[PDB]
């Protein structure tokens, strides 16, 4: 009967908890007690991007981290030259309710998706003067919350159907479905190696996935509420997780557990985007507050606040060169800080 | 400026002109979220309103009095709505259709309405409450086989409002049922509302040709109430 399996699941859950407690020989707060604080990390809106009509739901930097895609629910992807406040493209979407976008690391392609369960992929290097939709990946049975390119031809796509899927864009077909999530999958971050990725759901859990083996390598479950946002630490051995529970939490893969929790009783609202800085020492959490907070990822104190937005910081991305943190909001504005 | 830099400025200005054109098309298009349970006849209202003209969102677009409306029948999402519904924090209205007939399911519709209304982001979004299937409600109350007091015991003591309009010369008991169902959602909206958004109750059937006219009148009154608050006249 099912009760035997439920009991064995409880047994393995207790075993996992005991093993995690047996690895918890220290906490990062204690180990970070010996190293100097990062101080007041003030930063200023160097560039503000006025182009969108409606709220920005998602934003993502290119590899040569100058171009910036931004996706708004007026049905535009705008690509910005952040150095010049200059629109290099503006892509009209087949469905306004876009919720995710990414660059291909090659720069050649830009993806988006949303309430229409498709991942619309747009080729920027077409010979024509305007961008064309090169594939529309349509197999998901729920809205797409995050699409991230593994390469010029592979894209991984989290959906509210509780699954992620890895697509071959030339085939237009799911190579792998990642099926273990019980809740609406909300956020996806690739490891720097792109061999692993982690996705946070509306289960209070994050799952680590192997893109080759097609399997859930680990599950991280210290959160209380929906993990709206997830971001690998640049070492690739840890990742941060923003939630409706107003906490960020940093999970280390090899310790298989919460290494740190970032929280402040003045904050009673969810995190909607998360990014690390290039050293990993700053954790940048976009709150619904509508402020936007910098945490010392190691010390877990508030280094500073990017208090420039009047509505949710829906998206937050640090350049691959680390030179700026872009922030985007339901204000329709992207503000770029350093 | 360099030739490439000037050329980039020229392309950005072309894009800006197109964005200004799309701005006017966007601002002149009034977006609507159509919500309702499987019972609630939502599809029949989309199909009727199309006379005014596998995927995760169905856009039915219609025009009344040269006003363009985009109405989004959300479909084939999962039943966890707390994340996708955040998108519609900028629609003019939520058309919440309700099967007014199946009193057993009506409490689910009440809790769905309460979740829409209390939600931090929909906190500015008015709800066009289509109490649908009024023909079947009338049949059910006139047949008397089923008894609202068993599902909503406060109906044992609720008395028909002085604003009540038994339009087709319908029975007093049918009217009492109708306006009770109305006043449950009005109690939810009236108690918790902050005055930034309002509930627009309507009684309807699939056969109602006037449902586009109702949505026009409600969106008109919503934008009026929005501006009249902004001008501190209301």
């Amino acid at each position: 009967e099912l009760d035997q399996l439920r009991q064995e699941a409880e047994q393995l859950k207790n075993q996992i908890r005991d093993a995690r407690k047996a690895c918890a020989d220290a906490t990062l707060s204690q180990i970070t007690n010996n190293i100097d604080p990062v101080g007041r990390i003030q930063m200023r809106t160097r560039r503000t991007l006025r182009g969108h009509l409606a709220k920005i739901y998602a934003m993502h930097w290119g590899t040569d981290s100058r171009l910036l895609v931004s996706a708004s629910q007026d049905g535009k992807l705008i690509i910005w030259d952040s150095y010049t406040t200059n629109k290099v493209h503006a892509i009209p979407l087949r469905s306004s309710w876009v919720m995710t976008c990414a660059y291909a690391p090659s720069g050649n392609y830009v993806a988006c998706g949303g309430l229409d369960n498709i991942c619309s992929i747009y080729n920027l290097k077409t010979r024509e003067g305007n961008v064309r939709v090169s594939r529309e990946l349509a197999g998901h049975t729920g809205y797409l919350s995050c699409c991230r390119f593994l390469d010029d031809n592979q894209i991984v796509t989290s959906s509210g159907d509780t699954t992620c899927a890895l697509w071959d864009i030339e085939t237009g077909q799911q190579t792998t479905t990642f099926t273990g999530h019980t809740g609406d999958v909300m956020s996806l971050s690739l490891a720097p190696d792109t061999r692993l990725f982690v996705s946070g759901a509306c289960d209070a859990s994050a799952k680590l996935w192997d893109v080759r083996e097609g399997m859930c390598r680990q599950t991280f479950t210290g959160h209380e509420s929906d993990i709206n946002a997830i971001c690998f630490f640049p070492n690739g051995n840890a990742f941060a997780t923003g939630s409706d529970d107003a906490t960020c939490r940093l999970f280390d893969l090899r310790a298989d557990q919460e290494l740190m929790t970032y929280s402040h009783d003045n904050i009673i609202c969810g995190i909607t985007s998360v990014s690390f800085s290039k050293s990993g020492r700053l954790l940048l959490a976009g709150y619904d507050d509508f402020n936007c907070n910098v945490w010392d990822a190691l010390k877990a104190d508030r280094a500073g606040v990017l208090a420039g937005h009047d509505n949710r910081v829906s998206c937050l991305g640090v350049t691959d060169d680390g030179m700026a943190v872009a922030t985007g909001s339901w204000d329709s504005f992207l503000k770029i800080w350093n | 400026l360099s030739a490439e830099d000037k050329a980039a400025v020229e392309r950005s200005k072309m894009i800006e002109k197109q964005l200004q054109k799309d701005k006017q098309v966007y601002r002149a298009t009034h977006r609507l979220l159509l919500l309702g349970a499987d019972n609630s006849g939502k599809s029949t209202i989309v199909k009727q309103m199309r006379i005014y003209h596998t995927s995760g969102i169905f856009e039915t677009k219609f025009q009344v009095d040269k006003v363009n409306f985009h109405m989004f029948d959300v479909g084939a999402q999962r039943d966890e709505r707390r994340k996708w519904i955040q998108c519609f924090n900028d629609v003019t209205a939520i058309i919440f259709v309700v099967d007014s007939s199946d009193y057993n399911r009506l409490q689910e519709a009440l809790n769905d309405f309460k979740s829409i209304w209390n939600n931090r982001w929909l906190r500015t979004i008015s709800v066009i409450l289509f109490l649908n299937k009024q023909d079947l409600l009338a049949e059910k109350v006139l047949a008397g086989k089923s008894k609202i007091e068993d599902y909503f015991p406060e109906f044992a003591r609720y008395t028909t409002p002085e604003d009540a309009t038994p339009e087709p010369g319908e029975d007093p008991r049918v009217t009492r049922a109708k306006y009770f169902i109305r006043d449950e959602f009005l109690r939810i909206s009236t108690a918790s509302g902050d005055g930034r958004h309002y509930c627009y109750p309507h009684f309807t059937c699939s056969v109602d040709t006037e449902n586009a006219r109702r949505i026009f009148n409600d969106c008109r009154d919503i934008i009026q109430r929005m501006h009249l608050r902004q001008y501190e006249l209301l």
């Epitope: - | 966890e80 709505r81 939600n119």
Partner: nanobody, 127 residues
């Protein structure tokens, strides 16, 4: 880990009284609006009752409103439902369901067929 282990079900006579209990764990229980939900056999997830963070507000479905009382102890992290006058209509797997987000008034998805923040549930049966 968020868990909502629940106990107090069984079999009762019509007109009997029962006391469901839900040992919430893994979340800051005081911050969350707590719901009871039930699934009668072959039916949907009927919502049953709701209690605010402080308990200063409560709500019920009319099928139970005069009959069940929802209560919480925020130090024990226990949610309760006393069922003073059970009826054969009440036979269901009950589930304590937490609101999704803390400090929040909209209890979305608590009735959703798969929802993370809900117990495995207690069966109530009535003769």
């Amino acid at each position: 880990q968020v868990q909502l282990q629940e106990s107090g079900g069984g079999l009762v006579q019509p007109g009997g009284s029962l006391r469901l209990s839900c040992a919430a764990s893994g979340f800051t229980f005081s911050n969350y609006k707590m719901n009871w939900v039930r699934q009668a056999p072959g039916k949907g997830l009927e919502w049953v009752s709701d209690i605010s963070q402080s308990g200063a507000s409560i709500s019920y479905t009319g099928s139970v409103k005069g009959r069940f009382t929802i209560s919480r102890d925020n130090a024990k992290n226990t949610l309760y439902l006393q069922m003073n006058s059970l009826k054969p209509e009440d036979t269901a797997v009950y589930y304590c369901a937490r609101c999704p987000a803390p400090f929040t008034r909209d209890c979305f998805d608590v009735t959703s067929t798969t929802y993370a923040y809900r117990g495995q549930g207690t069966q109530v049966t009535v003769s």
